[PDB]
């Protein structure tokens, strides 16, 4: 059971998965050190601002690290971010 300061039960399921990526092994410590970036858990539109990410990282890189993110924090929003990512793999008018 990870901390509830913030998210629920169904959000915290996947953080406990998701911390095993060697990629995103500061996961349970950066909702704590950005406590105040809160947007994208409640409300507003999520998926054009996606905080935090996964060395420079390719733009695709970066969709991969937000759609992970998503994933396990907003799963509604996981349509909009795989719409974005195929925006930004394909084209915008793909």
């Given at each position: ?11 915290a399921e996947a ?80």
């Amino acid at each position: 059971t990870p901390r509830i300061q913030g998210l629920t039960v169904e959000q915290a399921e996947a953080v406990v998965r998701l911390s095993c990526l060697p990629a995103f092994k500061d996961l349970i410590a950066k909702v704590q050190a950005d406590e105040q970036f809160g947007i994208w858990l409640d409300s507003s539109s999520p998926e054009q601002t996606v905080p935090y990410l996964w060395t420079p990282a390719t733009p695709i890189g970066q969709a991969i690290h937000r759609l992970l993110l998503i994933q396990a924090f907003r799963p509604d929003r996981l349509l909009a971010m795989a719409h974005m990512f195929v925006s930004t793999n394909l084209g915008e008018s793909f």
